[PDB]
Symmetry: none
Subunit: 445 residues, 2 copies
């Protein structure tokens, strides 16, 4: 086992992600990141999870033990930590959370001083520290010990900063929010009220036990019920830690991350704000999003699946907008990580500046009929080389022109191979899948 997965260390709080481990991540983490600074400084925030406090105590203790200064942020979104760590001139910032996962889980994610994820080489150096039998690092003593303090102003500094990315205010709109009972439970209702909108809220009553429970971006249907009943203009579903956004138009339909990105780029190009007129998405987003995006002279920059990819691509390209189907969207001009509340602001601003309803804005692309089945392989590298699968693809590839896409490929996350088809008809694309899936199943299942 390595410890840092695709986005920090996750695991069940007190059973895999133990206080013991959390401390060590703090100490090795602090030491790695603190190393080459006189006056080292780390900020730390979290979502509303029960285990939040147990892990924050360990992480603070571990940080302090290296000599670093800690600033406690309280409950804040993960983008908030990102923003603040760059803006405060901290060396690193830590966010305790497992995002949309259920309460038992937690996680620890670091941003370094430029507001980005740690370099591989730094993460690596941490992991090797977690590997040694004995801790033989510095033990600063007496008056060389780390100092801690509260920086609860942070959240609102953050708030003021995103708030002012808006044109005029939101008056005349009714906006419903679902804050997943997580990090945005108090921030997002504040922010939208400050912006003069009428609000109805749900999932804004965290108690420690209830984060993401039948609420939030991955269960937006209850919000969609609220939107219809409260007769609202838009619903906004953030996840546990406020990096994803999923919307609901005024008719009750879910408007996903593709639709959101599409609305943003359309309006950004029209306003001359979309750098080099391109949008970055993983290869995993819908074909209709691609064709829509081109119908408006907007060039598409597609990456491997992961958001590290979308992000690295934005950085190198000098791009400006990118993200995934899931509502993780990056407005790199402002925040250095995806931000649900930030992207929700930009969304509501477009409804406002164009005086058009969400169903309309969203309906200016048309998503293709999709179908995705993950099948449980038994080592991908062989199936990736498996002649019968490789040709079952070739056969459906030959069938469509088109006028269709097939996408089959695993990861390292869950071990499984992900067959996915898109065609103008549901029937066809169900049919290519059921096919490609029979072959995989019989050959590797």
């Amino acid at each position: 086992g390595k410890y840092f997965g695709t986005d920090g260390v996750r695991g069940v709080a007190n059973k895999e992600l133990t206080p013991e481990l959390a401390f060590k991540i703090g100490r090795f983490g602090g030491y790695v990141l603190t190393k080459d600074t006189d006056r080292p400084k780390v900020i730390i925030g979290r979502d509303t999870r029960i285990s939040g406090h147990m892990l924050e105590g360990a992480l603070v203790a571990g940080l302090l033990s290296t000599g670093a200064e800690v600033m406690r942020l309280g409950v804040i979104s993960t983008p908030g930590v990102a923003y603040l760590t760059k803006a405060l001139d901290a060396q690193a910032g830590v966010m305790i959370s497992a995002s949309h996962n259920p309460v038992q889980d937690n996680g620890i994610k670091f941003f370094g001083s430029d507001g980005f994820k740690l370099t591989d080489e730094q993460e690596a150096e941490i992991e090797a520290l977690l590997d040694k039998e004995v801790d033989e690092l510095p033990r600063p003593t007496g008056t060389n010990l780390g100092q801690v303090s509260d920086y609860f102003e942070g959240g609102q500094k953050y708030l003021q900063y995103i708030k002012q990315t808006v044109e005029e205010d939101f008056s005349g709109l009714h906006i419903a929010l679902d804050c997943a009972h997580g990090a945005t439970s108090s921030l997002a209702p504040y922010l939208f009220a400050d912006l003069e909108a009428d609000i109805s809220t749900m999932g804004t009553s965290p108690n420690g036990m209830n984060i993401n429970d039948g609420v939030g971006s991955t269960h937006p249907e209850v919000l969609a019920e609220l939107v219809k009943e409260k007769g609202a203009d838009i619903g906004l579903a953030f996840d546990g830690d406020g990096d994803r956004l999923i919307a609901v138009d005024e008719k009750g339909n879910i408007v996903d991350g593709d639709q959101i990105m599409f609305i943003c780029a359309k309006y950004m190009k029209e306003t001359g704000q979309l750098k080099h007129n391109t949008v970055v998405s993983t290869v995993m987003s819908n074909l209709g999003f691609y064709k829509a995006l081109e119908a408006n002279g907007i060039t598409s920059d597609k990456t491997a699946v992961g958001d590290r990819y979308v992000m690295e691509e934005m950085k190198r390209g000098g791009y400006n907008l990118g993200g995934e189907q899931s509502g993780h969207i990056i407005l790199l001009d402002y925040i250095t990580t995806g931000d649900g509340m930030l992207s929700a602001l930009q969304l509501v601003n477009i409804m406002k500046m164009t005086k058009k309803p969400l169903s309309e804005l969203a309906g200016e692309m048309t998503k293709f009929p999709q179908l995705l089945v993950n099948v449980r392989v038994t080592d991908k590298k062989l199936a990736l080389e498996n002649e019968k699968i490789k040709e079952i693809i070739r056969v459906v590839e030959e069938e469509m022109n088109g006028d269709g896409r097939i996408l089959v490929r695993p990861s390292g996350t869950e071990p499984l191979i992900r067959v996915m088809a898109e065609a103008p008809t549901q029937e066809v694309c169900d049919a290519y899948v059921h096919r490609i899936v029979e072959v995989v199943k019989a050959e590797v299942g």
Copy 2:
């Protein structure tokens, strides 16, 4: 091993690691939690910088057993003990190393009854502290402990200790030295609220400055303050307010022996000093004992340490005990040494008798005594040694009659304690520094 005789002490982050502290939090928590439902532990600290790191680890540890935790912030140790009896928690923890310099911190526990844990409880935490892997329960999800703040706890403590006095303190001018420690905000409110004139020093903890040039083991700057601002009394507390040492109006130090007497005599005068005995360690000076005898007060003497005094008081139902150091116990009110409490009681006599401190202290006479503490690296080796052991021999059979000696390891600090009392300060000091230079030279 880990458990000294008064918590677990060490220099923060070198011997008292946050790792160790986490364990003490979890294992202790567990041992103290097992036999209750909805379990609850409170936790307070002095002003040492390392207090926060250690709190972080302790709270982690406690939360991980499922216990609920209430954070007190900076508060004196007797306060931790008062509240853990009062708020009906199963334990109170205090993070402090008393009068020690900054590097040092310590962790002391209090039980449901506000007393220090049974040797049986202490032994079992110890016995878990040794175990190979921990197979203690790890509650997950919604069984995890919640934390919250109880930062009014201090005021509740102050309310209590307040009413233990006969009348207000008006027309008295009181100087305080709070050792830049746990009493910093507590003490000044407390006395001010009893309508007294207040001057302060050592009330600006920056986290680095506890006991440093201030507080009860360094009362002189205070002594000057009292004289400078024409005070009626000076009161120096220690880092965590378990000690008091005072200054009379003329600027003379009034130590623990002198306080115990001033209180002892008055308690006796007012028929409220149990069995007319005072418990002390065998460290108090002749003049102390001799002024307790004149006055028909029975002196009861233990071996050295707070543990031994409390036990004695506990067993014989006595209600006033303490040490020369100013660690004084008024059992009727509070379940541990309490500096500020002693203060109130003392200031109380002054006010009730209409007497100034010099004449209260002056009732008893200090005989010549010196205790010098050598800063050493192995108590063990130290005492059983060739260049030290013998000197002691030669001196002893010289005072006869007619003087005395007590040389011994500490139990909680890295020092040896050398003490003599004799018929003159001159011989007394000579007896000691003779040994000292030697310890100083032999054992680092």
